[PDB]
Amino acid sequence: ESFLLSKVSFVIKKIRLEKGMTQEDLAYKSNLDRTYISGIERNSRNLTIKSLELIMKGLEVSDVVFFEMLIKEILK
Amino acid sequence: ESFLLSKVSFVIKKIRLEKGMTQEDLAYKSNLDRTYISGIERNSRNLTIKSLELIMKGLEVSDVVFFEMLIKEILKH
Amino acid sequence: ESFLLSKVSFVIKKIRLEKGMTQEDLAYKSNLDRTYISGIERNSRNLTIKSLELIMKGLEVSDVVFFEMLIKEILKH
Amino acid sequence: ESFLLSKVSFVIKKIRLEKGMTQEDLAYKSNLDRTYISGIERNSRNLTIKSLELIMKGLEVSDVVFFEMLIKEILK
DNA sequence: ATGTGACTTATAGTCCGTGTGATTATAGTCAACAT
DNA sequence: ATGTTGACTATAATCACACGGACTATAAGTCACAT
């Protein structure tokens, strides 16, 4: 697997939780598949930017906040 | 098309020129086709995080540094 | 345009495919531009004996056997 | 300089002589410059196929006969 | 609720080639004077 | 006759790039069945 990919996924999971969402609800909100999301969170998926963008919409988080977070997460 | 993509697209080119690289050099070190590097910069193609990671390694730049410039380009007017 | 040129350009391609090479290998091995190899085959282009020699070295072929295949191509109907 | 380019030039000179032609006449017959011809024969020019072709027409020699000769000259 | 697996279908990514403006090196062509 | 030296100017040859079609790998999106 990839280092970045795991932290993207970790971040996605982090934010979903800090907000109190279920996967079911992140899937609904972003108009994507729930198993799709589960896959990403166990990090069994290699998103495209577009997909990442949809997940950010679903999380209701701007690109900037996401990347600010991803950076922080990246530095152990 | 996509907001984030053209930003990612823009930043890949910006860095590449800042480092005096050519598409040929880049696609070189990213072990992607020079067609793909062109494709990305040209028509903001929808790359995968893994591919983006390869390009970062190609640009001889870190995850962090890239995303910090990404944030800057998004914030601009 | 020129009789001999399209014969030369035909034979460069023939050999290139016979040896299972691609254009951009040959462009490397011949120590000439990517687009020049294309341009020679694609249209014809008016190359120099020195450049022709480089290509022959690149096709991994001798002056002699090149010209022998050149003669054969000229002689065709 | 180049081996091939030398043998080419030598051949051009050879054929010119076996036909009893002067350079002046070889240049008239192919409409090129006499100093141009001179230059090739003293191996100071790297001609293009197009030019080579004009010289063959000026020598009144077919492409095939030229290369047949060029091959033989190439083999010592 | 979340996590599998496995199975299509869209598309990301590859591979080989075409065609092009802009710049640099050099062949094409023609002087003057040689011998 | 041929040789040589500068020249000017056409174009060979370079360099960075765009663009397309066809093919291969894989992400996108949806089932069934776990827990």
Tab-separated table of C-alpha atoms (C1' of nucleotides) in Angstrom:
chain	number	residue	atom	x	y	z
A	1	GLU	CA	0.000	0.000	0.000
A	2	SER	CA	0.871	3.720	0.040
A	3	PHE	CA	1.763	6.012	2.915
A	4	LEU	CA	-0.278	8.921	1.631
A	5	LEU	CA	-3.244	6.730	0.826
A	6	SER	CA	-3.384	5.464	4.389
A	7	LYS	CA	-3.387	8.932	5.832
A	8	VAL	CA	-5.935	10.250	3.409
A	9	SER	CA	-8.104	7.366	4.592
A	10	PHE	CA	-7.186	7.906	8.181
A	11	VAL	CA	-8.093	11.565	7.815
A	12	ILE	CA	-11.405	10.734	6.123
A	13	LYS	CA	-12.203	8.441	9.027
A	14	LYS	CA	-10.998	10.998	11.593
A	15	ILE	CA	-13.239	13.757	10.270
A	16	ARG	CA	-16.245	11.463	9.909
A	17	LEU	CA	-15.906	10.714	13.616
A	18	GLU	CA	-15.120	14.216	14.903
A	19	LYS	CA	-18.448	15.072	13.262
A	20	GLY	CA	-20.306	12.052	14.614
A	21	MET	CA	-21.220	10.489	11.259
A	22	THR	CA	-21.722	6.877	10.376
A	23	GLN	CA	-20.324	5.500	7.099
A	24	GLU	CA	-23.889	4.990	5.999
A	25	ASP	CA	-24.430	8.707	6.412
A	26	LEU	CA	-21.149	9.763	4.806
A	27	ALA	CA	-22.119	7.651	1.814
A	28	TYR	CA	-25.604	9.226	1.650
A	29	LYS	CA	-24.293	12.767	2.031
A	30	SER	CA	-21.655	12.426	-0.649
A	31	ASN	CA	-23.865	10.379	-2.995
A	32	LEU	CA	-21.447	7.440	-3.053
A	33	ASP	CA	-21.696	3.743	-2.152
A	34	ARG	CA	-21.389	2.678	1.486
A	35	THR	CA	-19.195	-0.333	0.695
A	36	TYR	CA	-17.154	2.108	-1.364
A	37	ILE	CA	-16.550	4.172	1.760
A	38	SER	CA	-15.913	1.177	3.982
A	39	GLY	CA	-13.274	0.163	1.492
A	40	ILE	CA	-11.506	3.499	1.624
A	41	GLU	CA	-11.564	3.550	5.423
A	42	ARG	CA	-9.986	0.105	5.704
A	43	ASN	CA	-7.808	1.650	2.954
A	44	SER	CA	-8.665	-0.849	0.224
A	45	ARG	CA	-9.137	1.963	-2.274
A	46	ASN	CA	-6.935	4.315	-4.202
A	47	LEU	CA	-9.162	7.321	-4.777
A	48	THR	CA	-9.017	9.753	-7.573
A	49	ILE	CA	-9.031	13.424	-6.732
A	50	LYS	CA	-12.614	13.628	-7.986
A	51	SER	CA	-13.748	11.015	-5.513
A	52	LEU	CA	-11.840	12.634	-2.725
A	53	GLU	CA	-13.689	15.824	-3.617
A	54	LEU	CA	-17.034	14.149	-3.255
A	55	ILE	CA	-16.070	12.774	0.143
A	56	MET	CA	-15.052	16.227	1.251
A	57	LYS	CA	-18.472	17.493	0.123
A	58	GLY	CA	-20.084	14.714	2.099
A	59	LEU	CA	-18.014	15.445	5.189
A	60	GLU	CA	-18.796	19.135	4.611
A	61	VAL	CA	-15.190	20.182	4.848
A	62	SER	CA	-13.427	22.509	2.505
A	63	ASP	CA	-10.458	21.323	0.484
A	64	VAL	CA	-8.266	23.551	2.579
A	65	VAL	CA	-9.373	22.207	5.918
A	66	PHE	CA	-8.954	18.690	4.638
A	67	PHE	CA	-5.443	19.337	3.489
A	68	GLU	CA	-4.490	21.284	6.582
A	69	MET	CA	-5.557	18.185	8.501
A	70	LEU	CA	-3.898	15.706	6.194
A	71	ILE	CA	-0.610	17.530	6.586
A	72	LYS	CA	-0.804	17.490	10.337
A	73	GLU	CA	-1.716	13.837	10.289
A	74	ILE	CA	1.201	13.153	7.935
A	75	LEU	CA	3.784	14.423	10.433
A	76	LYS	CA	3.141	11.579	12.936
B	1	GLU	CA	-15.239	19.924	-14.557
B	2	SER	CA	-13.619	19.637	-11.095
B	3	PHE	CA	-12.424	22.412	-8.808
B	4	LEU	CA	-9.659	20.521	-7.022
B	5	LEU	CA	-8.281	18.943	-10.183
B	6	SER	CA	-7.346	22.055	-12.070
B	7	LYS	CA	-5.722	23.259	-8.862
B	8	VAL	CA	-3.782	20.013	-8.567
B	9	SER	CA	-3.047	20.318	-12.289
B	10	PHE	CA	-1.833	23.900	-11.915
B	11	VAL	CA	0.468	23.128	-8.976
B	12	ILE	CA	2.125	20.184	-10.688
B	13	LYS	CA	3.083	22.409	-13.617
B	14	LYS	CA	4.069	25.346	-11.415
B	15	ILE	CA	6.515	23.274	-9.406
B	16	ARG	CA	7.807	21.536	-12.506
B	17	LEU	CA	8.805	24.858	-14.077
B	18	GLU	CA	10.075	26.266	-10.814
B	19	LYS	CA	12.520	23.341	-10.845
B	20	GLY	CA	13.477	23.904	-14.474
B	21	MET	CA	12.173	20.469	-15.391
B	22	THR	CA	10.548	19.561	-18.631
B	23	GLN	CA	7.607	17.247	-19.028
B	24	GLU	CA	10.068	14.707	-20.371
B	25	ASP	CA	12.229	14.827	-17.232
B	26	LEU	CA	9.150	14.689	-15.057
B	27	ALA	CA	7.411	11.765	-16.697
B	28	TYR	CA	10.830	10.311	-16.479
B	29	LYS	CA	11.277	10.409	-12.776
B	30	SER	CA	7.631	9.757	-12.049
B	31	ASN	CA	7.806	6.629	-14.144
B	32	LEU	CA	4.646	7.692	-15.974
B	33	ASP	CA	4.284	8.310	-19.729
B	34	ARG	CA	5.144	11.825	-21.009
B	35	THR	CA	1.731	11.688	-22.558
B	36	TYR	CA	0.211	11.420	-19.077
B	37	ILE	CA	2.146	14.340	-17.583
B	38	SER	CA	1.023	16.366	-20.590
B	39	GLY	CA	-2.505	15.091	-20.177
B	40	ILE	CA	-2.581	16.162	-16.545
B	41	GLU	CA	-1.273	19.686	-17.075
B	42	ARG	CA	-3.292	20.150	-20.264
B	43	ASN	CA	-6.784	18.966	-19.497
B	44	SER	CA	-6.561	18.641	-15.713
B	45	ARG	CA	-6.977	14.821	-15.808
B	46	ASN	CA	-8.404	12.863	-12.879
B	47	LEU	CA	-5.450	11.174	-11.295
B	48	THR	CA	-5.266	8.709	-8.519
B	49	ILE	CA	-3.588	9.466	-5.161
B	50	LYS	CA	-0.956	6.840	-6.029
B	51	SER	CA	-0.228	8.577	-9.295
B	52	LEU	CA	-0.120	11.938	-7.580
B	53	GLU	CA	2.351	10.435	-5.121
B	54	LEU	CA	4.584	9.284	-7.949
B	55	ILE	CA	4.512	12.753	-9.422
B	56	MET	CA	5.457	14.287	-6.115
B	57	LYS	CA	8.433	11.947	-5.931
B	58	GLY	CA	9.176	12.924	-9.517
B	59	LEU	CA	9.057	16.649	-8.744
B	60	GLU	CA	11.569	15.867	-6.009
B	61	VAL	CA	9.112	17.402	-3.526
B	62	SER	CA	7.428	16.072	-0.337
B	63	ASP	CA	3.780	15.233	0.402
B	64	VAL	CA	3.710	18.142	2.782
B	65	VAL	CA	5.355	20.730	0.533
B	66	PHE	CA	3.000	19.838	-2.284
B	67	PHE	CA	-0.108	20.110	-0.200
B	68	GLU	CA	1.122	23.408	1.235
B	69	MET	CA	1.360	24.854	-2.257
B	70	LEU	CA	-1.943	23.221	-3.115
B	71	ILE	CA	-3.539	25.099	-0.256
B	72	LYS	CA	-1.957	28.334	-1.470
B	73	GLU	CA	-3.214	27.943	-5.054
B	74	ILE	CA	-6.749	27.151	-3.844
B	75	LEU	CA	-6.725	30.316	-1.718
B	76	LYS	CA	-5.920	32.720	-4.496
B	77	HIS	CA	-7.293	35.842	-6.133
C	1	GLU	CA	8.781	15.303	-53.677
C	2	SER	CA	12.001	13.245	-54.026
C	3	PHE	CA	12.187	9.707	-55.427
C	4	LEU	CA	15.044	8.413	-53.311
C	5	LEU	CA	13.836	9.981	-50.072
C	6	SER	CA	10.576	8.127	-49.816
C	7	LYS	CA	12.588	5.001	-50.574
C	8	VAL	CA	15.029	5.805	-47.782
C	9	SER	CA	12.207	6.663	-45.387
C	10	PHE	CA	10.369	3.489	-46.358
C	11	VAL	CA	13.408	1.321	-45.613
C	12	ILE	CA	14.139	2.952	-42.277
C	13	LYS	CA	10.611	2.073	-41.177
C	14	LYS	CA	10.753	-1.426	-42.648
C	15	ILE	CA	13.881	-2.277	-40.701
C	16	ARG	CA	12.600	-0.560	-37.589
C	17	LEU	CA	9.553	-2.815	-37.517
C	18	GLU	CA	11.476	-5.915	-38.566
C	19	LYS	CA	13.679	-5.415	-35.505
C	20	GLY	CA	10.588	-4.916	-33.351
C	21	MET	CA	11.766	-1.435	-32.423
C	22	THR	CA	9.565	1.508	-31.704
C	23	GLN	CA	10.234	4.986	-32.985
C	24	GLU	CA	11.444	6.360	-29.723
C	25	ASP	CA	13.924	3.567	-29.059
C	26	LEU	CA	15.395	4.232	-32.474
C	27	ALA	CA	15.342	7.943	-31.706
C	28	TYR	CA	17.486	7.184	-28.676
C	29	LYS	CA	19.858	4.660	-30.179
C	30	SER	CA	20.374	6.964	-33.194
C	31	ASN	CA	21.088	9.889	-30.922
C	32	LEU	CA	18.594	12.083	-32.729
C	33	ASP	CA	15.331	13.735	-31.682
C	34	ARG	CA	12.145	11.754	-30.990
C	35	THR	CA	10.231	13.809	-33.542
C	36	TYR	CA	12.914	13.537	-36.210
C	37	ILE	CA	12.502	9.777	-36.529
C	38	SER	CA	8.780	10.359	-36.783
C	39	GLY	CA	9.197	13.140	-39.304
C	40	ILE	CA	11.456	11.005	-41.491
C	41	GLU	CA	9.001	8.129	-41.690
C	42	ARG	CA	5.808	10.201	-41.455
C	43	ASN	CA	6.314	12.605	-44.241
C	44	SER	CA	9.590	12.002	-45.825
C	45	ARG	CA	12.319	14.431	-44.750
C	46	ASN	CA	15.601	15.283	-46.424
C	47	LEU	CA	18.262	13.836	-44.209
C	48	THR	CA	21.958	14.120	-44.297
C	49	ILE	CA	24.361	11.229	-44.918
C	50	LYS	CA	25.678	11.742	-41.365
C	51	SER	CA	22.168	11.509	-39.983
C	52	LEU	CA	21.414	8.497	-42.139
C	53	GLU	CA	24.545	6.877	-40.727
C	54	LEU	CA	23.364	7.536	-37.186
C	55	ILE	CA	20.078	5.907	-37.967
C	56	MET	CA	21.826	2.904	-39.464
C	57	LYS	CA	23.852	2.478	-36.312
C	58	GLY	CA	20.539	2.820	-34.473
C	59	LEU	CA	18.723	0.216	-36.537
C	60	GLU	CA	21.690	-1.923	-35.508
C	61	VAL	CA	22.379	-2.492	-39.186
C	62	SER	CA	25.441	-2.041	-41.439
C	63	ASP	CA	25.870	0.586	-44.196
C	64	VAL	CA	26.080	-2.302	-46.594
C	65	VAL	CA	22.920	-4.224	-45.678
C	66	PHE	CA	21.018	-0.935	-45.462
C	67	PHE	CA	21.946	-0.054	-49.005
C	68	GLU	CA	21.193	-3.606	-50.138
C	69	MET	CA	17.631	-3.240	-48.856
C	70	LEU	CA	17.515	0.243	-50.330
C	71	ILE	CA	18.307	-1.162	-53.759
C	72	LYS	CA	15.621	-3.829	-53.381
C	73	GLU	CA	12.981	-1.252	-52.485
C	74	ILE	CA	13.850	0.998	-55.416
C	75	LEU	CA	13.410	-2.040	-57.685
C	76	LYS	CA	9.743	-2.696	-56.924
C	77	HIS	CA	6.419	-3.083	-58.752
D	1	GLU	CA	34.470	13.230	-40.524
D	2	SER	CA	32.438	10.190	-41.582
D	3	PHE	CA	33.384	6.916	-43.241
D	4	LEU	CA	30.257	6.699	-45.359
D	5	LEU	CA	30.465	10.324	-46.316
D	6	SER	CA	34.008	9.721	-47.527
D	7	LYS	CA	33.091	6.693	-49.563
D	8	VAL	CA	30.131	8.545	-51.027
D	9	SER	CA	32.415	11.368	-52.108
D	10	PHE	CA	35.003	8.981	-53.424
D	11	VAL	CA	32.323	7.222	-55.443
D	12	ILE	CA	31.025	10.511	-56.864
D	13	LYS	CA	34.559	11.366	-57.946
D	14	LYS	CA	35.184	7.833	-59.286
D	15	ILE	CA	32.117	7.862	-61.523
D	16	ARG	CA	32.869	11.372	-62.674
D	17	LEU	CA	36.279	10.188	-63.890
D	18	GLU	CA	35.301	6.866	-65.490
D	19	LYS	CA	32.932	9.058	-67.516
D	20	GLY	CA	35.720	11.521	-68.329
D	21	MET	CA	33.810	14.450	-66.791
D	22	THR	CA	35.224	17.576	-65.293
D	23	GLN	CA	33.816	19.059	-62.070
D	24	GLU	CA	32.835	22.104	-64.065
D	25	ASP	CA	30.801	19.840	-66.290
D	26	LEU	CA	29.398	17.792	-63.410
D	27	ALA	CA	28.091	20.998	-61.863
D	28	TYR	CA	26.636	22.270	-65.185
D	29	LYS	CA	24.871	18.966	-65.749
D	30	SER	CA	23.193	18.842	-62.382
D	31	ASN	CA	22.692	22.587	-61.906
D	32	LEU	CA	24.671	22.983	-58.714
D	33	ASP	CA	27.692	25.135	-57.885
D	34	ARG	CA	31.122	23.966	-58.999
D	35	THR	CA	32.661	24.940	-55.676
D	36	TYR	CA	29.893	22.880	-54.124
D	37	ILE	CA	30.942	19.840	-56.137
D	38	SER	CA	34.584	20.510	-55.456
D	39	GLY	CA	33.807	20.585	-51.770
D	40	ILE	CA	32.077	17.224	-51.731
D	41	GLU	CA	34.954	15.532	-53.589
D	42	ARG	CA	37.520	16.877	-51.121
D	43	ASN	CA	35.063	15.460	-48.572
D	44	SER	CA	34.222	18.826	-47.018
D	45	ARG	CA	30.467	18.431	-47.434
D	46	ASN	CA	27.811	16.414	-45.707
D	47	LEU	CA	25.227	16.250	-48.415
D	48	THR	CA	21.567	15.481	-48.140
D	49	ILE	CA	19.832	12.769	-50.063
D	50	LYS	CA	18.256	15.434	-52.256
D	51	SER	CA	21.635	16.779	-53.218
D	52	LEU	CA	23.060	13.330	-53.665
D	53	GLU	CA	20.182	12.734	-56.047
D	54	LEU	CA	20.931	15.769	-58.122
D	55	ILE	CA	24.503	14.623	-58.434
D	56	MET	CA	23.468	11.177	-59.605
D	57	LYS	CA	21.294	12.768	-62.267
D	58	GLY	CA	24.211	14.957	-63.249
D	59	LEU	CA	26.447	11.907	-63.437
D	60	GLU	CA	23.754	10.180	-65.527
D	61	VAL	CA	23.649	7.204	-63.224
D	62	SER	CA	20.726	5.436	-61.688
D	63	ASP	CA	20.291	5.270	-57.930
D	64	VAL	CA	20.820	1.545	-58.081
D	65	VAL	CA	24.059	1.691	-60.022
D	66	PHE	CA	25.359	4.278	-57.591
D	67	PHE	CA	24.631	2.217	-54.545
D	68	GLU	CA	25.872	-0.968	-56.132
D	69	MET	CA	29.127	0.918	-56.538
D	70	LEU	CA	29.005	2.496	-53.133
D	71	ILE	CA	28.651	-0.912	-51.538
D	72	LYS	CA	31.618	-2.275	-53.414
D	73	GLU	CA	33.777	0.678	-52.537
D	74	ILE	CA	32.713	0.303	-48.890
D	75	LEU	CA	34.175	-3.209	-48.856
D	76	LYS	CA	37.830	-2.103	-49.270
E	1	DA	C1'	-24.585	-0.230	11.794
E	2	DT	C1'	-19.869	-2.038	9.318
E	3	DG	C1'	-16.991	-5.594	6.510
E	4	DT	C1'	-16.540	-9.026	3.169
E	5	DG	C1'	-16.338	-11.051	-1.537
E	6	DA	C1'	-17.022	-11.247	-6.030
E	7	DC	C1'	-18.808	-9.506	-10.169
E	8	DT	C1'	-19.567	-5.755	-14.208
E	9	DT	C1'	-18.481	-1.025	-16.411
E	10	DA	C1'	-16.437	2.960	-16.494
E	11	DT	C1'	-12.284	5.164	-16.672
E	12	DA	C1'	-7.408	5.792	-15.146
E	13	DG	C1'	-3.034	4.807	-17.067
E	14	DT	C1'	-0.141	2.752	-20.900
E	15	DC	C1'	1.861	2.499	-25.344
E	16	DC	C1'	2.953	3.925	-30.032
E	17	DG	C1'	2.404	7.325	-33.013
E	18	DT	C1'	1.095	12.181	-35.458
E	19	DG	C1'	1.722	17.239	-36.131
E	20	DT	C1'	3.534	21.818	-34.655
E	21	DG	C1'	5.377	26.228	-33.525
E	22	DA	C1'	10.324	28.221	-32.081
E	23	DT	C1'	14.981	27.980	-31.673
E	24	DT	C1'	19.910	26.415	-33.050
E	25	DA	C1'	23.270	24.170	-36.091
E	26	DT	C1'	24.483	23.522	-40.462
E	27	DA	C1'	23.889	22.433	-45.591
E	28	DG	C1'	22.825	24.884	-49.701
E	29	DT	C1'	24.261	28.474	-52.937
E	30	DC	C1'	27.102	31.882	-54.518
E	31	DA	C1'	30.615	35.807	-53.970
E	32	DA	C1'	36.551	36.794	-54.680
E	33	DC	C1'	40.775	35.203	-55.536
E	34	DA	C1'	43.938	30.982	-55.873
E	35	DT	C1'	46.563	27.800	-58.385
F	1	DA	C1'	40.481	23.494	-65.206
F	2	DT	C1'	40.254	22.752	-59.520
F	3	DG	C1'	40.908	24.705	-54.477
F	4	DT	C1'	39.931	27.614	-50.591
F	5	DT	C1'	38.209	31.511	-47.806
F	6	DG	C1'	34.455	33.815	-46.175
F	7	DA	C1'	29.992	35.073	-46.708
F	8	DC	C1'	24.515	34.967	-46.755
F	9	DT	C1'	20.077	32.160	-46.365
F	10	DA	C1'	17.633	28.220	-46.641
F	11	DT	C1'	16.743	24.348	-44.212
F	12	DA	C1'	18.329	20.256	-41.496
F	13	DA	C1'	18.029	19.105	-36.860
F	14	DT	C1'	16.748	20.158	-31.953
F	15	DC	C1'	13.713	20.898	-28.020
F	16	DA	C1'	9.464	21.373	-25.385
F	17	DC	C1'	4.761	20.448	-26.217
F	18	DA	C1'	-0.072	19.099	-27.807
F	19	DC	C1'	-3.197	15.545	-29.433
F	20	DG	C1'	-5.275	11.157	-31.024
F	21	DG	C1'	-6.510	6.237	-31.081
F	22	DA	C1'	-6.134	1.513	-29.076
F	23	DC	C1'	-5.090	-1.226	-25.718
F	24	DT	C1'	-4.476	-2.834	-20.520
F	25	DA	C1'	-4.910	-2.236	-15.600
F	26	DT	C1'	-7.756	-0.789	-12.143
F	27	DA	C1'	-11.073	2.470	-9.779
F	28	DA	C1'	-15.869	3.343	-9.762
F	29	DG	C1'	-20.206	1.788	-8.630
F	30	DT	C1'	-23.671	-2.127	-7.330
F	31	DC	C1'	-25.184	-7.104	-6.001
F	32	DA	C1'	-25.366	-10.633	-2.077
F	33	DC	C1'	-24.163	-12.081	2.744
F	34	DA	C1'	-21.892	-11.867	6.450
F	35	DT	C1'	-21.333	-9.604	11.557
